[PDB]
Design an enzyme around this catalytic site. Sequence first.
Site, mmCIF file in Angstrom:
data_model
loop_
_atom_site.group_PDB
_atom_site.id
_atom_site.type_symbol
_atom_site.label_atom_id
_atom_site.label_comp_id
_atom_site.label_asym_id
_atom_site.label_seq_id
_atom_site.Cartn_x
_atom_site.Cartn_y
_atom_site.Cartn_z
ATOM 1 N N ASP A 27 16.761 5.266 -19.085
ATOM 2 C CA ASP A 27 16.148 6.508 -19.525
ATOM 3 C C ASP A 27 15.673 6.384 -20.962
ATOM 4 O OD1 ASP A 27 15.452 9.174 -20.247
ATOM 5 O OD2 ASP A 27 17.523 9.936 -19.944
ATOM 6 N N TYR A 100 8.815 8.199 -3.161
ATOM 7 C CA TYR A 100 8.218 8.046 -1.828
ATOM 8 C C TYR A 100 7.687 9.304 -1.151
ATOM 9 C CZ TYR A 100 10.269 3.258 -1.878
ATOM 10 O OH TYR A 100 10.640 1.964 -2.201
ATOM 11 N N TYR A 195 10.651 10.305 10.811
ATOM 12 C CA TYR A 195 11.560 11.337 10.324
ATOM 13 C C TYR A 195 10.785 12.639 10.263
ATOM 14 C CZ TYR A 195 14.175 7.239 9.693
ATOM 15 O OH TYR A 195 14.834 6.048 9.965
ATOM 16 N N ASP A 199 2.623 12.786 8.433
ATOM 17 C CA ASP A 199 1.913 11.555 8.658
ATOM 18 C C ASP A 199 0.434 11.694 8.474
ATOM 19 O OD1 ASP A 199 2.826 8.706 9.402
ATOM 20 O OD2 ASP A 199 1.353 9.022 11.057
ATOM 21 N N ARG A 227 2.648 -3.177 -3.755
ATOM 22 C CA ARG A 227 3.657 -3.363 -2.727
ATOM 23 C C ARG A 227 3.471 -2.212 -1.772
ATOM 24 N NH1 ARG A 227 8.149 -1.485 0.524
ATOM 25 N NH2 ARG A 227 8.518 -0.144 -1.250
ATOM 26 N N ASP A 229 4.120 0.284 1.201
ATOM 27 C CA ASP A 229 5.204 0.793 1.979
ATOM 28 C C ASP A 229 4.818 1.112 3.426
ATOM 29 O OD1 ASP A 229 7.893 2.445 2.175
ATOM 30 O OD2 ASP A 229 6.180 3.856 2.712
ATOM 31 N N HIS A 233 3.853 1.144 10.174
ATOM 32 C CA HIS A 233 3.634 2.569 10.548
ATOM 33 C C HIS A 233 2.227 3.159 10.338
ATOM 34 C CE1 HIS A 233 7.667 2.381 11.707
ATOM 35 N NE2 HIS A 233 7.940 1.785 10.557
ATOM 36 N N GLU A 257 5.863 -3.951 3.364
ATOM 37 C CA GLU A 257 7.162 -3.920 3.946
ATOM 38 C C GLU A 257 7.095 -3.724 5.437
ATOM 39 O OE1 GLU A 257 10.282 -1.565 2.177
ATOM 40 O OE2 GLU A 257 11.585 -2.327 3.805
ATOM 41 N N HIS A 327 16.219 -2.105 -1.706
ATOM 42 C CA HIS A 327 16.669 -0.712 -1.536
ATOM 43 C C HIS A 327 16.974 -0.314 -0.092
ATOM 44 C CE1 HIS A 327 12.638 -1.487 -0.983
ATOM 45 N NE2 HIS A 327 12.456 -0.338 -0.280
ATOM 46 N N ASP A 328 16.742 -1.205 0.870
ATOM 47 C CA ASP A 328 16.944 -0.890 2.288
ATOM 48 C C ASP A 328 18.093 -1.596 2.968
ATOM 49 O OD1 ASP A 328 14.872 0.901 2.462
ATOM 50 O OD2 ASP A 328 13.554 -0.749 3.232
ATOM 51 N N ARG A 375 21.551 2.167 -4.803
ATOM 52 C CA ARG A 375 20.599 2.608 -5.807
ATOM 53 C C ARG A 375 21.268 3.211 -7.022
ATOM 54 N NH1 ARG A 375 16.719 3.260 -0.510
ATOM 55 N NH2 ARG A 375 16.036 5.265 -1.348
HETATM 56 CA CA LIG Z 1 13.611 10.268 -18.882
HETATM 57 CA CA LIG Z 2 1.739 6.678 10.283
#
Ligand SMILES: [Ca+2]
Ligand SMILES: [Ca+2]
Length: 686
Positions: A27, A100, A195, A199, A227, A229, A233, A257, A327-328, A375
């Site tokens: 931070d 995200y 989820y 979309d 990168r 994401d 999909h 990914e 992260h996954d 995380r």
């Molecule tokens: Ca900050």
């Molecule tokens: Ca899609």
Amino acid sequence: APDTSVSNKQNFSTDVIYQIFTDRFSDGNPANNPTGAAFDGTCTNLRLYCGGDWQGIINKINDGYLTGMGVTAIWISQPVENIYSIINYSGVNNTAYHGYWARDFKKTNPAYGTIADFQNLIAAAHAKNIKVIIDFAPNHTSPASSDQPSFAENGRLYDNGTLLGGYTNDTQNLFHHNGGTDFSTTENGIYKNLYDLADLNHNNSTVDVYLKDAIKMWLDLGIDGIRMDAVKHMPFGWQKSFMAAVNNYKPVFTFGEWFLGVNEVSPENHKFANESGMSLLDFRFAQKVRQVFRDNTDNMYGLKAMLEGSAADYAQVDDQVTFIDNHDMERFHASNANRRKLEQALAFTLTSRGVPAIYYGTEQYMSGGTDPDNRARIPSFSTSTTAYQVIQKLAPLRKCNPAIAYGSTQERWINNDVLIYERKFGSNVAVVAVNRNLNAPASISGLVTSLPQGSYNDVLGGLLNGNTLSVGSGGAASNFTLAAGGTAVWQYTAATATPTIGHVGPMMAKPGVTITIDGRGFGSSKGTVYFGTTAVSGADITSWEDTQIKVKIPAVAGGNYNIKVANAAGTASNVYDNFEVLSGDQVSVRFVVNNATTALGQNVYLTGSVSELGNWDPAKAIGPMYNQVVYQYPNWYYDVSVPAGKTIEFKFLKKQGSTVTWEGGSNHTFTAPSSGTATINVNWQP
Ligand SMILES: [Ca+2]
Ligand SMILES: [Ca+2]
Ligand SMILES: OC[C@H]1O[C@H](O[C@H]2[C@H](O)[C@@H](O)[C@@H](O)O[C@@H]2CO)[C@H](O)[C@@H](O)[C@@H]1O
Ligand SMILES: OC[C@H]1O[C@H](O[C@H]2[C@H](O)[C@@H](O)[C@@H](O)O[C@@H]2CO)[C@H](O)[C@@H](O)[C@@H]1O
Ligand SMILES: OC[C@H]1O[C@H](O[C@H]2[C@H](O)[C@@H](O)[C@@H](O)O[C@@H]2CO)[C@H](O)[C@@H](O)[C@@H]1O
């Protein structure tokens, strides 16, 4: 500039990427921290904002933390404006700390910083020879509920402050309204929501054009890579038309990914990395590395098989981004585990083919389960850990030993627990020995290498209990004992006399774009570049050095070409294959064929008159087409990248194995849009 320069946005093989969750790093500017219920300065609650930002990153670049480690690229959270709502998910409050949940792809997430903070970040990084990669997540906006528009931000999408539309009353059809995926099929996880995320419909021109414009701004801001994401999909054809927009404008290294599970090997994954214009995070590598070095559910033989197979399945194996966690996945290091396992997997990754990525905090031995446990906030900036020193000694070899950045991989000694492999490129060699057995030493006899006669000190200096190596004539090493948990790196570097191409980037573009050809032995005087049989020399070769050549793609017909270079004296190099020349700029068009009934195991494919459709070659036809979601069998559909404004003739075919049945009649025809998307609907001709 040389291949290893910070300016090379087309090649990350000589870099070491450090993956950061911006919020959890540092931070450095408390003033932009969210307030109230969205914020937790102690970072005890892993679902809220802890406050890390761009200033923080800038500080860590300047106080020597990242540079001391040898890191040369950073990969940060999606920088775009996220929704501001706190989402309660059954008692638990969640914030967009991850980046995200996009609301406007044209503005910054103020918790991270302003546009000015972004530019300062790019500047600082660049100044210290560190490239900057950003996450880009164009598959969706945010969590939405169609009949409870008051939930979250209803997946709202803005264009630099201006409302485009929301998930409720989506008359424009910005989004898909097909339900949620069960991840059952590929078609199923593409055209339905993940989820509850709204979309995006990439077949809608507004969305299409909006995203292609949004990415141009970031390119313009100075980014060095992207990168992507959720690439499994989104439509493959759309994604290709997106890579083309990037490459035909300002090429940068892009990797996406596509998650793979343990023991999962997918041909759709290989085809995507081979044909889309982007490469992928190497899940096959990571899952394997974990089985071998972490979970002990496979052995060296399985690691070796992953190395050989992958070199064969991926057209550009050296562009797949490798890692041991991210992260996954739960963190590699388990609380009660021997640290040596993590040290070894790291040493392995760093000296292996591809582009290595280190998840932040790995060098600090952070432990943690799945999201959000993996995380947490980096607990310290100590440079005294063994892991930090492993990286520090090894990362730099990717810049100074091309065998590591671009060589072949070859197993020279193996058993259940030990792997000795050699990387080779030109007159450059690296030999690495790993003994996963933390309890037993190994007697290594019969090791043959390509190193020249001599003694070699362990590059890690004995840090992981490595030893010296003695190679006699013939390259045969004398007997030695490889310590328990031992890891040793030996190497030899020398000038390469003949032109050797180690890498080409971008791998797909229209004529006229400049590509970067990296390797060694090119000499300092301009030579010739061949695209297929076409020779290019002179002025179109915009730059030429020993390790790097920049040249414009000639105006040749679209198709796939081999690249070869010849020095000023005429010595030609090795062939670099799979380079795709586009027929022009691209647009994504949806082809729909009605009443094409098939037998089991028989699918419909599309082919046509341009290289983007395989030029009438059924072996290169596009498909299999889809027939579940958007259109139902015996109707088939598919989103395809095609050259804009071109008049194209096409036909559908039914394939079974390599047996082909053509549509009857004459070729269908159509003229691709100049921009935006389109949908061509026809009936199968018997
Ligand atoms: Ca900050
Ligand atoms: Ca899609
Ligand atoms: O000596 C040449 C030979 O070296 C390696 O073979 C090892 C083997 O991996 C060990 O398990 C053990 O059996 O010693 C052998 C060397 O004597 C290479 O794997 C092999 O391909 C190569 O022929
Ligand atoms: O989901 C795609 C599926 O379609 C094709 O199979 C047709 C089949 O040929 C028909 O006889 C009918 O029963 O519907 C199927 C589609 O649901 C391919 O044969 C198949 O491999 C493919 O997965
Ligand atoms: O070989 C190029 C050629 O391919 C296609 O021709 C098909 C034809 O449409 C079929 O009915 C069938 O008989 O096989 C031919 C393959 O040679 C294209 O239709 C044609 O325009 C193109 O030149």
